[PDB]
Amino acid sequence: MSFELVAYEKLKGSIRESIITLIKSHNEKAKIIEDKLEYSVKEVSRERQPQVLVLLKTIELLDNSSKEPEDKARVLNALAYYIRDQIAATYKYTSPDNSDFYKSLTISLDLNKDNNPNREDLADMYSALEKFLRSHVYKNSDPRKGYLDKQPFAIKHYSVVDDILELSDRVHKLRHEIIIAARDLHLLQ
Amino acid sequence: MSFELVAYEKLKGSIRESIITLIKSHNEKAKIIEDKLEYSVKEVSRERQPQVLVLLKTIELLDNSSKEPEDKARVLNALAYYIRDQIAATYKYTSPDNSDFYKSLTISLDLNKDNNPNREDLADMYSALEKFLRSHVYKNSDPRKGYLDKQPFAIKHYSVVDDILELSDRVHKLRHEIIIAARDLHLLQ
């Protein structure tokens, strides 16, 4: 079981489409400005607002980056996957499919029984995402050197540093598990 | 407060000298073969045996490596510092200076009130040490790819994988703390 990254342009497109649909599910008459989707974000629930703005800021920054297509894809796939998981965690006894946005993330990512991230994949994805965020929070991505004067991720009801720590924790746990699994495979061969 | 790495040859020399002294503290007549110090390790306590063998194997591997002097130094300093800390943890209410080997590690490292590793230093040291060990346990340093057929660190009463996990945990915690401290500096400027 392994995950193929969705190509960046395609994923960008389907995420933007799902955001438009989310906006319209609250207000069918919303006037969408194509190159200013963030201005319509006020239409979605307080809970979804920062997730949407982080996705859109991520897309704007990657679009302006010098990154190669696969690295751009790895970042956007990782964030979509992460936000999807964040929504799943808010459901304590029924399906997260109850959230149309959740469903749209599953679809955008083309997730299915045979196409789904293993520990390695997740470690690579979340690591790339964590690096990306650090690159847009700290001088030289290095918190020792302080914060950038301009904080693209200073978004209301969002803590980019909380996300960096969390992503770092998941990566750390995933790398731990990979080591442990290799040990068991070694000793039990 | 920052730590200057001790140059590799010098550190190698003083660690080898302290090992000889440790051996001789049990058996004043021990016959030391210069290029085979590990054969004399049987003379030290069961507890010190794996620490000594890991230090000596580390030195042999660095000596055979293509590493630049500063990277060699970073690895050896890190391991000496780590083993020193491991000994300190075995003292629950009196000074670890009670251990002559502990004292020798403090001296070899030239540790003092103004020359002592900060979080950054430790993070860099333990990371370099963890990488080094992985490079001598797994194919391409990558546990996903399995274990090397030859395990230089398969040393009795020692688990190199336990050490990789532990080093990884300390690095993870140190990086966490660095982030947290940068945040407080940011918000409290």
Author numbering:
A (entry chain A), B (entry chain A): 1 to 189
Q: What's in the article?
A:
Among all bacterial pathogens, Legionella pneumophila maintains the largest known set of translocated substrates, delivering over 300 proteins to the host cell via its Type IVB, Icm/Dot translocation system. Through detailed structural and functional analysis, we show that metaeffector activity derives from a diverse range of mechanisms, shapes evolution, and can be used to reveal important aspects of each cognate effector's function.
In addition to its inhibitory effects on MavQ, SidP synergizes with another effector, Lem14 (Lpg1851), to cause a severe growth defect when co‐expressed in our yeast screen. A citric acid molecule was found inside a positively charged pocket at the ends of α1–4. The synergistic effect of SidP and Lem14 is dependent on the SidP phosphatase activity and Lem14's charged pocket. Co‐overexpression of wild‐type SidP and Lem14 caused a sicker than expected growth phenotype in yeast, but any SidP or Lem14 mutant alleviated this effect. In contrast to the SidP‐MavQ interaction described above, the synergistic interaction between SidP and Lem14 does not appear to involve a physical interaction as tested by the Y2H assay and LUMIER. Indeed, together with our suppression data, the observation of SidP‐Lem14 synergy makes SidP a remarkable hub of effector activity within the eukaryotic cell, likely linking SidP/MavQ host lipid modulation with the as‐of‐yet undiscovered function of Lem14.
